[PDB]
Amino acid sequence: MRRYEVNIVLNPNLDQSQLALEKEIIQRALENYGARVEKVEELGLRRLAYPIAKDPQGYFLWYQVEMPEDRVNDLARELRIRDNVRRVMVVKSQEPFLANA
Amino acid sequence: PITKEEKQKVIQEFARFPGDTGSTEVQVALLTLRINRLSEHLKVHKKDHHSHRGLLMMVGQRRRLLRYLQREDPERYRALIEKLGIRG
């Protein structure tokens, strides 16, 4: 059981219901691939350096989770199934490494 | 892959006397473990050769150690084999 970080960038265009629906499907996802959520950051609408899906912006979440490694990929596969989801990036959590310290 | 726990089991299992880390027994048991883990990896990924080199080297070390056991103590040897399900 390892710590990862799940990055999800979805539609700038979602209103309250559609978005809290997406978030709901994400919860259900994580939960049914066996992930416990340690902390979360919803940074929301933010300004992309290049256009993704013809939209210049994206809605950013990040979730730091503990899950079984063996299912990690399938989880992402699931997260990606959704239409409104245009980026998924899962990382194995790494301890912060800082220059100038 | 192989947890500090899985390892601990196998060592505390095979140790002559408590705290015996590197006896011929133990080494042969860790090896067997690593080898079976690895050959299992290689029943899929039959295309991964560089690992399979690791495997041959590993079996070399194993056999080395055993023929040394057979040399010094035909007992500890025979017993450790049957317990470890080797000779093939």
Binding site: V9, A49, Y50, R87, P96 | -
Partner: protein, 73 residues
């Protein structure tokens, strides 16, 4: 050339595994999209090497640009 500004003297302690931090990572891309050399970052061998990956993760998410058009010239 390149003895004028080293991006290491620019900020002090900063997380180099942080691929979400735009304005800091963004400090390492040239006028084009290009990831700057060790020269002008003045990073260390390993620092540089780590910058590479974290910046590519940033790129892939949409935070950092892949290539940018050159102004003037």
């Amino acid at each position: 050339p390149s003895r004028k500004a080293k991006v290491k003297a620019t900020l002090g302690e900063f997380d180099l595994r942080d691929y979400r931090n735009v304005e800091v990572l963004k400090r390492f891309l040239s006028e084009t999209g290009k990831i700057l050399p060790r020269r002008r970052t003045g990073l260390s061998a390993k620092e540089q090497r780590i910058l590479a990956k974290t910046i590519k993760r940033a790129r892939i998410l949409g935070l950092l640009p892949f290539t940018e058009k050159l102004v003037r010239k």
